[PDB]
Amino acid sequence: KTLCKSWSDMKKHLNDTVSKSFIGRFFKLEARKTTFTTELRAATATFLTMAYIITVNANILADSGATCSINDCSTVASSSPPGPECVLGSNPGYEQCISRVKKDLVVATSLSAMVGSLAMGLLANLPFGLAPGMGANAYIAYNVVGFRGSGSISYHTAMAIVLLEGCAFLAVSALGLRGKLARLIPQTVRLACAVGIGMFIAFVGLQMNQGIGLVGPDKSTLVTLTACAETDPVTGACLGGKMKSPTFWLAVVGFLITSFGLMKNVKGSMIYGIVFVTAISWIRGTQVTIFPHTPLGDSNYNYFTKIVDFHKIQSTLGAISFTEFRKSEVWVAFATLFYVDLLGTTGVLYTMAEIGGFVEDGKFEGEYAAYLVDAGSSVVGSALGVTTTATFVESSAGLKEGGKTGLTAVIVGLYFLASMFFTPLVTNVPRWAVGPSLVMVGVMMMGVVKDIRWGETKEAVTAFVTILLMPLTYSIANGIIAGIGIYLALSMYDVVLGVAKWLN
Amino acid sequence: KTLCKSWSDMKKHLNDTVSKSFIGRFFKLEARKTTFTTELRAATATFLTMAYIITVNANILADSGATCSINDCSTVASSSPPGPECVLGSNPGYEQCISRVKKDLVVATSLSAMVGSLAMGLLANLPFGLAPGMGANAYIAYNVVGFRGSGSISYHTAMAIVLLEGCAFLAVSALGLRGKLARLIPQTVRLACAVGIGMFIAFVGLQMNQGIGLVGPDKSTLVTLTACAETDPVTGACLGGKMKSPTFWLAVVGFLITSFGLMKNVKGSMIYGIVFVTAISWIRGTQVTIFPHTPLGDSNYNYFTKIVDFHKIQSTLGAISFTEFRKSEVWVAFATLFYVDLLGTTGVLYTMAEIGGFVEDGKFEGEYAAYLVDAGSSVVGSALGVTTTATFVESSAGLKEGGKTGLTAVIVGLYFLASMFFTPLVTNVPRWAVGPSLVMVGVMMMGVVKDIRWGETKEAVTAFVTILLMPLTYSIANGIIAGIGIYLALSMYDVVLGVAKWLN
């Protein structure tokens, strides 16, 4: 009987004693009508919903071959291994390097999230955390650096682009040239870019090398549904048997558990889907294991036996090279990244300002600092080996419970501190586990499609071309350019001419 | 001065004299408050908007190789031409056959449209015409018969499937088992199937063999943006130079003219886009011609010189074979076609009944006959060599002007009669001309996407999987099955169990 009353006899005392110290006046706990206990609940509610991006980022950036290259490949019977042999796989020397890089990138993501969340919390009094944004990881990894050394731009130039974008976004928002520039883009293309990004992200979660493996090549049509069980030992090709891949069905079950948990309003759901299909795919012996019986697979098992390990960044440290900025596509990629980051932290940071009573006429209490902290987080994360950071939409779950001061973004950072020590259990997440997690992101980003003015013709074609050309051409830069070209030709050639004639 | 008054001195007299004859009482021109002059304007307004499907159907069914096969191929230096040599192209013998088949299919489409429109007009007193439906052409051609003899099901079995579906839809609506069966499908999958069909139709209008030629194969990613100028002489492959294909830019200009004409509210627009880029691509000599300097291309020019020709169906006549119905996929295709046709003529035929004052409490004046005529049109068109017919949505343009009696659907049929004699100018429409026309169909079918309940989780996942898996797996049958599977597992395993437990 006294157990129930013990919580209440101490919670009020602790809340009264904490608010009267330096911290209570610092975080302004006497105003905004918020007690200390609610801050701990809201921080947990935000972290559990945001905890899924500690593994998706690592598995989506480790595919590009961050530091590993052709020089540190293994030795074979030939004289020297050629270009398209090591990076294609089936080589112990390159896979051992990629394992270390994957181990290194998790700590880099955790540190970047720590810095972003803590810097926002201490300097802006706003209760939402930070992490490497979802949407710019795929563009940098699967489109600029390429899949394991493909494309043209190398990894060092790709990380220099992040520094350049962060520095260019610092002195474009401190001056005040953001609202004059953020509202210049018409609402149709801005709103329809997210749908195309969601399609592109979900489409890459279905290939065999990236995701669970539905789609595959075909000789007559471009794509086909393989889901093949017996696949090629080296590359990916269907030999015999469709819809009988055990990994595919395990991934479908994992998707079903996430979908059933998102309804019924369970806060953290995208993490329990990954945990289930990973704990299942940790048992050695079956056909869905992540631990084979190869010497390469034994190297990943005599590291999972220990569950806590303080790992040091030793491969993907500061790696910046400006010696390749004199060509063309580097600037196009920089401009595309700037365009993606401009529309991201504009319609998101304001939506979470009208949920919680922060908003006033305009210019709520965290306008100036929250933008500079968000922009400098990308700079501070670029040297660590991760892409640009952004304010996560999933931080709204903490606002709905009562968190209003800046203490939430400090406890989120402190939670992210304790998630770095568990690297052994984060490196060993299979790709078919994070496959289902790339589809729900697209599903939740598609929810804004029911605001485009489909009644008009120009606003419908401009949205449809942008939505369609992004996943079918396998490029994010090919959607924005097409949308802008369609929008300019339909209107600027008829409307602007009238304005020019009206000057006479 | 008398010229203006001449029209008015005769229009009222003609309207008074026509309504007092047998036709006036037959079509009930004294009720429904409609004069004869409005019927001629509404028929033209319907035909001009519907006139685009006399060429898209022919070019989308001629790609499957309707009658041509391996037996009537040409003779080469080898003993006998193998399977994958003739059907892949670069053979005069097969192309000469496919030219005759394309000439034959236009008359078959015109006759099917004539019969459907005239049968609805005379027997149902409803002012909307008929034509081979848009959406079932691609499924039958590009998915069942395959691209030039691909796939498993042959052409004769594909036309037997149409007869079987028509006969099964006759005695499912005459009994009364339509409303009990049409409302059983939940609204989410029914509404999201159209968006996926639009995506699949627009995606096939971008390949090189089907459409204008943006997308192409890639070794690492599945699809890429080629738009290559110098292409392989036999097959389709990019050799050098992107975004400099003259046909691609001609098609983009044609798309721009259609998009600019659909706004400003011009009734017929999808036909003036085709006419422009065809009249341009009829001049012999340039790089965008449809008349090369080959002996094959000269055979298509000493037939365009004559502009009127009464052609007779002599290849794609009644061609039905039931000797291949004992395998599996035939029934799956029949069921998919039935599912597509059930949702089509249910949400469309009622929408055009509340625009014009036809509708009452329920059961407007054309419920019973309009369904049987629409179902029997598929049967009567199957023997002619075209797929199932459907009531076109583009027939609403005639309702907005004043057409209310059945005379509109007779004049539309009479217009379709005069469009058969111009076969020479209909067979010589290039594929890059109809490429832009396959995209606007998807754009106009996407306009219903802003009604799915995106707020809920089940109704969002069920719609998103159906939308996504249709174009990315290049199949319409793989979207419905996935949507139904997602919808059943999310709800039937939790809701139906409660109902079963409530019986105790």
Residues 6+ apart with CB under 8 A from B29: B18, B19, B23, B35, B36, B405, B407
The total number of residues shown for chain B amounts to: 504
- Both tokens of B405, joined, read 């009696």
**B499 and B423 housed in the same domain:** no
The kind and range of the H/E element at B72 are none
- What is the C-alpha to C-alpha distance for residues B269 and B257, in angstroms, rounded to an integer? 8
Do residues B179 and B50 share a domain? yes
Q: Quick check: is A248 in a domain? A: yes
| DSSP letter string, A313-369 | --SSSS----TT-SSSHHHHHHHHHHHHHHHHHHHTTTGGGSSSS---SS--TTHHH
In this structure, what token pair is assigned to residue A432? 């078919």
Q: Which residue has the tokens 């929008």?
A: A487
Q: Which two tokens stand for residue B153?
A: 């099901």
Burial class (CB in 10 A: 0-12, 13-18, 19+), B112: buried
Choose among B217, B450, B461: nearest Cβ to A443.
B461
How far is residue B199's CA from residue B472's CA, in Å, rounded to a whole number? 9
Expressed in Å, this structure's resolution amounts to 3.4
Say whether both B104 and B176 belong to one domain. Answer: yes
Element at A48 (helix H, strand E): helix A36-50
Q: Assess if residue B9 is contained within a domain.
A: no
Asked if B67 and B170 sit in the same domain, the reply is yes
How many domains does chain A fold into?
1
**CA atoms of B15 and B460, how far apart (whole Å):** 54
Cβ B215–A473 below 8 Å, yes or no? yes
Determine the distance from the C-alpha atom of residue B44 to the mean position of all C-alpha atoms in its chain, rounded to a whole number.
20
B395 with B460, same domain: the answer is no
Residue A208 phi/psi, 5-degree rounding, is -85, -40
- A95 domain residue, yes or no: yes
Is the Cβ–Cβ distance between A59 and A432 less than 8 Å? no
Is residue B363 included in any domain, yes or no?
Answer: yes
Q: Report CA Rg, chain B.
A: 24
Verify that B167 and B316 share a domain, yes or no. yes
For residues B452 and B460, the answer to whether their CB atoms sit within 8 Å is yes
In angstroms, the separation between the Cα of residue B462 and the nearest Cα of chain A is 10
Pick the closest to residue B160 from B385, B390, B391 (CA basis). Answer: B385
Q: Name the amino acid, one letter, at B461.
A: V
Q: Which residue has the tokens 């011609």?
A: B289
Per-residue tokens: A469: 């050309």
Interface test with B, best of A255, A468, A480 (most B CBs within 10 A): A468
The shortest C-alpha distance from A226 to chain B (Å) reads 9
Query: B485 with B423, same domain?
Result: no
Same domain as B175, residue B142: yes
* 3-state secondary structure at position B131: strand
CB count, 10 Å around CB of A399? 21
B465 Ramachandran zone, left/alpha/beta (phi>0; psi -120 to 50): alpha
Partners of A225 in the β-ladder: A215
Q: How far apart are CA A21 and CA A28, in angstroms?
A: 11
Torsion of CA A217, A223, A227, A233, to 10 degrees: 10
Residue A27: phi and psi, rounded to 5, are: -85, 0
For A386-409, the DSSP string reads ---EEE-GGGHHHHTTT--STHHH
Task: Write the single-letter amino acid at A452.
Answer: I
Which residues precede gaps in chain B, with C-N > 2.5 A? Answer: none
- Residue B131 near residue B112 (C-beta atoms within 8 A): yes
The answer to whether A316 and A384 are in contact (CB under 8 A) is yes
B216, containing H or E segment: strand B215-217
| Way it was determined | cryo-EM
Contacts of B327 (CB under 8 A, 6+ apart): none
Which chain A residues touch B223 with a CB distance below 8 Å?
A: 222-223, 472-474
Assess if residue B96 is contained within a domain. Answer: yes
* DSSP string over B180-205: HHHSSS-HHHHHHHHHHHHHHHHHTT
The verdict on B354 and B473 lying in the same domain is no
| Rounded Cα distance, B356 and B34, in Å | 11
Count of CB atoms situated within 10 Å of the CB of B438: 22
B106 and B56: one domain? Answer: yes
Residue A93 lies in a domain: yes
Quick check: B468 and A259 CB within 8 A? Answer: no
CB B274 within 8 A of CB B437: yes
* Cβ proximity of B89 and B33 under 8 Å: no
B273 inside domain: no
Domain assignment of residue A108, given as a range: 14-19+27-451
Does residue B443 form part of some domain?
no
**Cross-chain residue pair A450–B446, CB shorter than 8 Å:** no
Residues with Cβ within 8 Å of residue B453, at least 6 apart in sequence: B188, B459, B460
Q: Which residues of B touch A216 (CB under 8 A)?
A: 222
Helix locations, A70-186, DSSP H: 83-86, 92-124, 136-139, 155-173, 179-182
Q: Tell me B141's DSSP state.
A: I
Q: Kindly provide the residue ranges of all beta strands, DSSP E only, lying in A326-368, ordered along the sequence.
A: none
d(CA A50, CA B61): 51
Task: Collect all residues of chain B within an 8 Å Cβ-Cβ radius of residue A473.
Answer: 214-215, 223-225
Of B223, B455, B458, the CB nearest to A472: B223
Q: How far is A308 from chain B (nearest CA, A)?
A: 36
**What span, in angstroms and rounded, lies between the C-alpha atoms of B389 and B380?**
10
Asked if residues B250 and B257 have their Cβ atoms less than 8 Å apart, the reply is no
What CA–CA distances, in Å, run from A234 to A85, A87, A209, A237, B141? Answer: 11, 12, 11, 9, 35
The sign one gets for the Cα dihedral A24, A27, A32, A33 is negative
CB B291 within 8 Å of CB B282: yes
What are the CA-CA distances from residue B80 to residues A127, A257, B71, B76, B90 (Å)? Answer: 76, 57, 10, 7, 16
β-partners of residue B240 are B230
Cβ(A16)–Cβ(A394) under 8 Å? no
N- to C-terminal Cα distance for chain B?
Answer: 88
Determine the Cα angle at B410 with ends B405 and B416, to 5°: 140
Query: Do A150 and B220 make contact, defined as CB atoms within 8 angstroms?
Result: yes
CA distance A454 to chain B (A): 6
Write out the two tokens for B47. Answer: 């035909």
B497: Cα separation from own chain's centroid: 42
Q: In what helix (H) or strand (E) does residue A230 lie, and over which residues does it extend?
A: strand A230-231
| Residue B490 phi, psi (nearest 5) | -70, -35
What are the structure tokens assigned to A491, written together? 């209107």
Task: Give the residue among A103, A490, A140, A502 at the shortest CA–CA distance from A306.
Answer: A103
